[PDB]
Amino acid sequence: DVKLVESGGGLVKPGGSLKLSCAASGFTFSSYTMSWVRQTPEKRLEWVATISSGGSYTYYPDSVKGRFTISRDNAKNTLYLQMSSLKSEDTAMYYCTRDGNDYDYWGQGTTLTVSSAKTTPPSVYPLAPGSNSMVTLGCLVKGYFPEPVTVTWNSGSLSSGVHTFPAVLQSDLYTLSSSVTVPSSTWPSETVTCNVAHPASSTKVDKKIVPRDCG
Amino acid sequence: DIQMTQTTSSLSASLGDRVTISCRASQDISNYLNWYQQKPDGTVKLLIYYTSRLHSGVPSRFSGSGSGTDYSLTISNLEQEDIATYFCQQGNTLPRTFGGGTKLEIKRADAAPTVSIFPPSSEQLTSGGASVVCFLNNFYPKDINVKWKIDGSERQNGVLNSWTDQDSKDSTYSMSSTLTLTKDEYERHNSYTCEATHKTSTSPIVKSFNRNEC
Amino acid sequence: VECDFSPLLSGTPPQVYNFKRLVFTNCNYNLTKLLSLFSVNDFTCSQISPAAIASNCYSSLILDYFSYPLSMKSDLSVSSAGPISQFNYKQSFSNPTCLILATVPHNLTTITKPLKYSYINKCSRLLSDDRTEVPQLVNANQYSPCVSIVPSTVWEDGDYYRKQLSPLEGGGWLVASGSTVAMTEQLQMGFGITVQYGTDTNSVCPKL
Numbered sequence: 001d002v003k004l005v006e007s008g009g010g011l012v013k014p015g016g017s018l019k020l021s022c023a024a025s026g027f028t029f030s031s032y033t034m035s036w037v038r039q040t041p042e043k044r045l046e047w048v049a050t051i052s053s054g055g056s057y058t059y060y061p062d063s064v065k066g067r068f069t070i071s072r073d074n075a076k077n078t079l080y081l082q083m084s085s086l087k088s089e090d091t092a093m094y095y096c097t098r099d100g101n102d103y104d105y106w107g108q109g110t111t112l113t114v115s116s117a118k119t120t121p122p123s124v125y126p127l128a129p130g131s132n133s134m135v136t137l138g139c140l141v142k143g144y145f146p147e148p149v150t151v152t153w154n155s156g157s158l159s160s161g162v163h164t165f166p167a168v169l170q171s172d173l174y175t176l177s178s179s180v181t182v183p184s185s186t187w188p189s190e191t192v193t194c195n196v197a198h199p200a201s202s203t204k205v206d207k208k209i210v211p212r213d214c215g
Numbered sequence: 216d217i218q219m220t221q222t223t224s225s226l227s228a229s230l231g232d233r234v235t236i237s238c239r240a241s242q243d244i245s246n247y248l249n250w251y252q253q254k255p256d257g258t259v260k261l262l263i264y265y266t267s268r269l270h271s272g273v274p275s276r277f278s279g280s281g282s283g284t285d286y287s288l289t290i291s292n293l294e295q296e297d298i299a300t301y302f303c304q305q306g307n308t309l310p311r312t313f314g315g316g317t318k319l320e321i322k323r324a325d326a327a328p329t330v331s332i333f334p335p336s337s338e339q340l341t342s343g344g345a346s347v348v349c350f351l352n353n354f355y356p357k358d359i360n361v362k363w364k365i366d367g368s369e370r371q372n373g374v375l376n377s378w379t380d381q382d383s384k385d386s387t388y389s390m391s392s393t394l395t396l397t398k399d400e401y402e403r404h405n406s407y408t409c410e411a412t413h414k415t416s417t418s419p420i421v422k423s424f425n426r427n428e429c
Numbered sequence: 430v431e432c433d434f435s436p437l438l439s440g441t442p443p444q445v446y447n448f449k450r451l452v453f454t455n456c457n458y459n460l461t462k463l464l465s466l467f468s469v470n471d472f473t474c475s476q477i478s479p480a481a482i483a484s485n486c487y488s489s490l491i492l493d494y495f496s497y498p499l500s501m502k503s504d505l506s507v508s509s510a511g512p513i514s515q516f517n518y519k520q521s522f523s524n525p526t527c528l529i530l531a532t533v534p535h536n537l538t539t540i541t542k543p544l545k546y547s548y549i550n551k552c553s554r555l556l557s558d559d560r561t562e563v564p565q566l567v568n569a570n571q572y573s574p575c576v577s578i579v580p581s582t583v584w585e586d587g588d589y590y591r592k593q594l595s596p597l598e599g600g601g602w603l604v605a606s607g608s609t610v611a612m613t614e615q616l617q618m619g620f621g622i623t624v625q626y627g628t629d630t631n632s633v634c635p636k637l
């Protein structure tokens with residue numbers, strides 16, 4: 001199966017540079033024309049660049065040309081997107097796509113935040129209910145930057161009754177909560193734990209949900 | 216540049232329904248029009264290429280149509296996993312450009328919200344912060360209203376809310392509501408009340424807790 | 430430039446269930462120009478005012494038009510059950526919408542009249558076990574599924590129209606019944622307006 005994997009995204013200062021990469025597998029890479037399509041935080045999709053199979057040339061919208069450089073290493077099956085003179089209108093999820101008459105395969109994307117704001121570790125506070133066949137817990141991931149964070153429960157084990165709320169941005173800091181509902185039987189009979197990963201600050205903290213020791 | 220317009224930004228229908236999504240182009244693109252599905256987790260896959268041709272791996276219920284500048288996508292026999300946002304895209308001339316997108320909501324039975332309220336954790340209070348969190352989980356329709364009360368009086372300021380996209384599995388929506396004040400001010404009160412108003416009931420669902428009673 | 434409303438002025442307008450939809454972006458409009466060519470009987474909007482919709486900027490403007498007797502004005506309210514709102518026509522309840530009932534005057538000569546007024550009184554799905562009749566309420570900004578089996582004009586009041594659906598579509602039948610209203614001396618029409626706001630553009634604005 002055709003597979004596209006983006007890497008290299010991150011937080012960047014305005015005016016700065018960053019090179020994205022995309023690992024391609026499952027098809028003859030040198031045979032297809034490849035493109036980048038970004039999705040802004042506004043969910044707007046914008047074509048960014050495409051490069052020929054060879055590629056004897058490359059094509060850009062004006063809104064990106066002279067600053068971006070799409071390139072290709074057919075021997076090592078990777079696609080690149082060298083960005084420079086970065087703007088805040090460049091922050092978006094960036095997708096590696098296989099192209100031709102259409103973008104028939106998409107990678108999962110890698111994020112780019114172009115900000116002057118500072119990287120800040122998250123504080124993770126447990127949300128246990130105050131003192132039913134189901135019980136809802138939570139974690140409060142407060143004051144991190146930038147996006148994204150990852151939140152899982154018991155290292156992925158708890159996925160059924162889980163939904164993680166979208167982060168809310170306020171004063172250059174993000175905050176989100178995750179809600180997990182497990183039966184009342186395994187809590188607190190069985191350990192329930194939220195796992196917060198923040199790659200940008202390389203901070204990963206685990207928070208065991210302990211019942212509110214309310215004395 | 217060729218502009219791509221989708222007649223609507225959002226659409227809703229029942230399971231089994233036949234759904235159509237329309238797309239207008241600003242000039243003749245000669246059937247070079249593609250349709251993409253983006254699911255709530257963010258993953259994008261091609262559905263239809265060149266107006267009407269079914270992409271490999273995409274079920275027969277999906278179909279496309281149209282010519283000139285006016286094109287359509289159709290989903291017959293709506294299925295749960297069809298919850299997603301659908302985009303059109305023209306491939307006639309550079310720059311390649313996308314429609315603004317159409318979100319597909321799949322109708323379900325009315326459902327009242329599950330309401331949970333959490334006090335500030337000991338960790339947060341230690342650092343002088345006081346966030347009161349209220350969860351409003353798994354309800355339908357998506358519209359809902361939250362009202363906070365502190366020792367009986369309504370607090371509008373200092374509230375941060377967050378909504379889920381439609382749940383891919385149960386077709387519901389969920390919401391988070393957080394009231395942040397200072398530790399100094401949080402300790403100056405006793406009762407904090409969370410009221411959820413939803414069309415499922417004329418009386419609001421109420422969830423509260425006491426700071427001292429713990 | 431110039432939002433063209435000309436398609437409204439020529440030919441025989443469709444019935445309510447197969448309303449014509451004009452979509453405007455990247456152009457300048459004059460609402461008060463078009464409506465003046467008509468004899469307007471009613472002009473009701475939701476989440477917006479009649480004066481405002483003629484003078485605001487949008488990312489998109491949707492203009493639906495069809496034949497509709499002024500006598501069934503009642504059946505345009507989402508307030509009523511009504512065969513019209515349930516099976517034929519339902520606007521977006523989230524964006525600002527206007528609903529306009531006008532009569533084409535003697536001096537508007539380029540519009541032609543239909544033989545009569547037609548609407549869907551019933552749209553349902555007869556399931557595999559030929560017991561369960563399931564009504565098919567029209568979704569907002571959508572056509573009824575019964576547009577495919579109801580003729581552009583209903584042949585005779587009380588006509589049933591059926592088509593068998595495939596197992597893919599879940600088998601069974603699509604079943605519709607149609608109603609007719611006698612044509613009036615001058616044609617009575619209906620206009621549905623919907624406006625949308627978006628990232629960009631300043632696309633749809635009144636011309637000056």
Ligand SMILES: *[C@@H]1O[C@H](CO)[C@@H](O)[C@H](O)[C@H]1NC(C)=O
Nearest residue numbers: 465466467468534535536537
């Ligand atoms: C059409 O008739 C209406 C009233 O019957 C009148 O107000 C309008 O000026 C006339 N316009 C033309 C072009 O005849």
